Amino acid sequence: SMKIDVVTIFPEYLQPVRQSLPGKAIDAGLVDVAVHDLRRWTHDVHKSVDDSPYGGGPGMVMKPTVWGDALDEICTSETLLVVPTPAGYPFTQETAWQWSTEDHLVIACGRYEGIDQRVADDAATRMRVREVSIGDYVLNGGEAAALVIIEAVLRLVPGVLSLLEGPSYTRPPSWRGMDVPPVLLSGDHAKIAAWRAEQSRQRTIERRPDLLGFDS
């Protein structure tokens, strides 16, 4: 069984929910998802987890010490440590497929400004570390990215179950004066493929020219 540990200062946000893809996976015994409050590894009265950046700049940086004790306790040398970060390598469908075979994912959730770089540098001496971004929009912390990563990876785990998709339709064949493309009604597996391919092309070149090796 796969085991996923998430570490965060927002454990309630990351608490698994039964009616969800991860929830189904958990209840099917295919995965154990444990969530940990990073503040467990603080020792000061105020439970401080970050501090001002050396060299200045806006915002705060998470303290290396607290993350240190946390990952010390939760990780082994076989652990794949995932660290969401705006500055990471891209998280892709290829990445998802790869992590779907993993035995232990530990996901370190930190604020946008980052965890002290020495945390990941130190972890890499004992385990595999992957700093990744799920997109170039800006989230305030790694929490939502952790939820995205979990859903992308879990749906690939055995047992759990290029080009843009063109439009899709279902019943009724006429709705509010709008008709389904007749080829999709004609039952011709060949003509239908020709049409869907053509639609996908038009859509991809319009919305994602990058996918076909073009600019913008």
Annotated binding-site residues for S-adenosyl-L-methionine read 84, 110, 133-139
Residue tagged 């290029």 (tokens):
162
Q: Which does 84 bind (CB under 5 to 8 A by kind): a second copy, ligand JBH, none?
A: ligand JBH
Contact 105, 91 (CB under 8 A): no
- Minimum separation from the CB atom of position 75 to a second copy (A): 15
- Partner whose footprint covers residue 127, from ligand JBH, a second copy, none (CB < 5 to 8 Å by kind): none
Binding mask 135-164 for a second copy (x = CB under 8 A): xxxxxxx-xxx-xx--xx--x-----x--x
Task: From 26-34, 76-84, 100-108, 111-119, give the range in contact with a second copy by CB under 8 A.
Answer: 111-119
If we measure between CA atoms, which residue out of 96, 109, 107, 108 comes closest to residue 160? 96
- Residue by residue, DSSP assigns 13-58 as HH---SSSHHHHHHHTTSEEEEEEEGGGG--STT---EEPPTT--S
Q: List, in sequence order, every residue forming a beta bridge with 141; answer none if it has no partner.
A: 111
- What is the DSSP secondary-structure string of 128-197? EEEEEES-SS--SBSHHHHHHHHHHHHTTSTT-----------S-SEETTEEPPGGGTS--HHHHHHHHH
69 binds a second copy (CB under 8 A): no
Closer to a second copy by CB, 23 or 102: give it: 23
- For position 126 contacting a second copy by CB under 8 A, the verdict is no
Nearest to 67 by CA among 13, 107, 113, 12: 107
Write out the residues near ligand JBH by the rule CB under 6 A.
84-86, 112, 133-135, 137-139, 141-142, 145
d(CA 109, CA 141): 7
- The item of ligand JBH, a second copy, none sharing an interface with residue 30, based on CB under 5 to 8 Å by kind, is none
76 or 186: whose CB is closer to a second copy? 186
Task: Choose between 45 and 178: whose C-beta lies nearer to a second copy.
Answer: 178
Contacting a second copy (CB under 8 A), which of 102, 166, 201, 205? 166
User: Given candidates 28, 32, 76, 90, which one binds a second copy under the rule CB under 8 A?
Assistant: 90
* Residue whose C-alpha is closest to residue 99's, from 135, 130, 55, 138: 130
Q: In the set 40, 103, 167, 197, which binds a second copy (CB under 8 A)?
A: 167
